Amino acid sequence: RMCMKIENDCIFEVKLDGKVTGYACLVGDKVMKPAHVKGVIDNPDLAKLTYKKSSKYDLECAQIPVHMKSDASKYTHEKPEGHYNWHHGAVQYSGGRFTIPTGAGKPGDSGRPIFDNKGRVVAIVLGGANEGARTALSVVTWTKDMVTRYTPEGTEEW
Amino acid sequence: RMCMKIENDCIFEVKLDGKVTGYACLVGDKVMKPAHVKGVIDNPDLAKLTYKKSSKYDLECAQIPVHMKSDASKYTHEKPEGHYNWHHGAVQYSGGRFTIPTGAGKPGDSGRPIFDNKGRVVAIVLGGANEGARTALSVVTWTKDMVTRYTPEGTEEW
C-alpha cells in the first residue's frame, strides 16, 4: 500500500474544462503528461511552465520547479521478469508487455505510473488493447539514454 | 495434472472429413500446426487466416487473433538434462533426444506439445522412430533465433 501514497505526491490531474482526461506525474525532474490529454494541470506552478511537444512518442514534459523535486518520486530501469504494482491492481510483465485483467480500466485514467516492489517508478500508462481476459498496456518505457513507446496492435487510448 | 488443462486451452483440433488428423497449438502468438497434417482447424477464426508453408521444417503457422493470446500456452527455451511431461505420459530428455516408451503412440496424435515442470512449452511432436523399449521422437526444437527439426533415423510420421 506504499505505492498508493507514493502516487499521491507524484500524480497531478489534467482535465478538459474540468472533465479529467489524464494525470501528470513528477519523475526525476520531468512532469510526465501524455500528449493526447487536453487540459490544464491543477497546480499553477506546473501550468505556468513551457512544455515540450512530442507526437510519435506521445509525451509532454517540463522542468518542475526547485520546490517540486522533494515532492517527486525516484525512477528505475530494472524490468526483471515478474510482477509490478498499479493503482487499480497489478501489472504482469512477460515478454516486454504490460498486461492487466479486462475491467480494471475505463476511458480516461491515463498518466498513472507503474511501480515495482519498493516504490521506484518503471512506466507511464497511455492506453491499452483488449486481449481476452488479459488486456495489454500501451506504455512509455525507458533505458539509460532511450525512451521507447510500445503500443500493442488494436490499441484504444484510455 | 496442470499440463493437461494447459493443453486444453492451447490445443485446437485439426479435423479431416470427420477424423482429427492433428493438434494445432497457439504457442506464443501463432498456431503450431505440422505441415504433413491435411485438414481443417475446427475454430473458424484460425481457419480464415493465411498460413505460411514450410516443408524442410515441417510446420505451418499464422498470427492468432487478438482474442487468442490470452488463450495461448507459454513457451520457454530451457532444455536442462532431465524429465518433462506429455499428454500420454512422460518424455525422457538425454543427449538432445526426446524418447517415449513404445506403445504410448499410435498414428495420428501429432501436434501435441511437450511441457516442462511448471507449464512452459518446450516442444511440438511430429513423429518418432521405434527404438527398443524406448522409442524416440522427431520434434520441432527452438532457441533464441533458430528453430531446429531433429528427426531420428528410420522415423515414421505418427
Side-chain angles (χ1 to χ4, degrees):
Chain A
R1 62 200 172 283
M2 67 293 289
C3 306
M4 317 183 223
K5 183 178 279 80
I6 302 300
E7 246 159 350
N8 298 345
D9 41 278
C10 177
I11 287 265
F12 271 83
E13 295 102 313
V14 226
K15 27 200 173 180
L16 162 79
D17 29 80
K19 67 134 298 301
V20 175
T21 324
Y23 303 103
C25 229
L26 323 171
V27 177
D29 68 335
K30 305 292 178 175
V31 43
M32 292 300 186
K33 172 179 175 55
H36 72 293
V37 179
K38 297 304 201 233
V40 152
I41 313 296
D42 66 286
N43 187 342
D45 284 331
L46 297 176
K48 303 175 58 60
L49 289 157
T50 185
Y51 275 73
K52 294 193 52 188
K53 304 303 170 184
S54 184
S55 51
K56 182 200 306 177
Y57 283 59
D58 185 82
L59 206 59
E60 277 181 10
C61 293
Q63 297 294 52
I64 62 170
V66 50
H67 76 279
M68 304 249 73
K69 307 175 302 183
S70 151
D71 286 334
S73 58
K74 190 171 79 279
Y75 71 101
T76 197
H77 59 283
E78 312 301 320
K79 284 122 202 206
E81 193 68 346
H83 169 274
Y84 303 95
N85 304 86
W86 195 28
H87 179 119
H88 303 293
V91 196
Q92 183 129 316
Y93 185 69
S94 100
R97 298 185 46 175
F98 289 149
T99 177
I100 304 287
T102 317
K106 326 309 179 248
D109 186 50
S110 60
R112 296 212 171 273
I114 294 172
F115 300 74
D116 66 348
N117 58 4
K118 61 180 176 245
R120 303 186 305 211
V121 51
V122 73
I124 300 296
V125 62
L126 302 189
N130 187 334
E131 185 195 359
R134 290 311 301 229
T135 183
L137 276 192
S138 294
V139 70
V140 175
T141 305
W142 52 75
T143 61
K144 301 296 189 60
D145 302 301
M146 257 333 277
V147 297
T148 54
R149 168 207 185 181
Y150 178 64
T151 297
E153 64 275 344
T155 266
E156 35 95 16
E157 207 151 20
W158 52 270
Chain B
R1 62 200 172 283
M2 67 293 289
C3 306
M4 317 183 223
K5 314 172 57 181
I6 302 300
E7 233 162 350
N8 290 346
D9 48 80
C10 179
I11 280 289
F12 272 69
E13 265 66 59
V14 181
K15 211 200 60 154
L16 182 62
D17 293 72
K19 65 177 301 293
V20 165
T21 30
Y23 308 101
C25 225
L26 318 176
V27 180
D29 54 62
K30 280 155 203 291
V31 44
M32 312 299 285
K33 172 179 176 56
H36 72 293
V37 179
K38 297 304 201 233
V40 152
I41 308 292
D42 66 286
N43 187 342
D45 284 331
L46 297 176
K48 294 170 168 51
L49 289 157
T50 185
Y51 283 42
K52 299 210 64 173
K53 301 289 295 299
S54 183
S55 51
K56 179 196 299 295
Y57 282 59
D58 185 82
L59 206 59
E60 277 181 10
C61 293
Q63 297 294 52
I64 62 170
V66 64
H67 75 280
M68 308 244 72
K69 298 161 284 150
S70 151
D71 308 340
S73 66
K74 193 59 192 66
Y75 66 92
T76 195
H77 59 283
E78 295 191 3
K79 284 122 202 206
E81 193 68 346
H83 169 275
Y84 303 95
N85 304 86
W86 195 28
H87 179 119
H88 303 293
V91 193
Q92 183 129 316
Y93 185 69
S94 100
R97 298 185 46 175
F98 289 149
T99 177
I100 310 286
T102 317
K106 326 309 179 248
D109 186 50
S110 60
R112 296 212 171 272
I114 294 172
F115 300 74
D116 66 349
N117 58 4
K118 61 180 176 245
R120 303 186 305 211
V121 169
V122 73
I124 300 296
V125 62
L126 302 189
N130 187 334
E131 295 288 337
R134 290 311 301 229
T135 183
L137 280 181
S138 307
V139 77
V140 174
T141 305
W142 52 75
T143 60
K144 305 181 62 61
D145 302 301
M146 257 332 277
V147 297
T148 53
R149 168 207 185 181
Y150 178 64
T151 297
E153 70 283 337
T155 266
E156 66 144 337
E157 295 214 14
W158 52 270

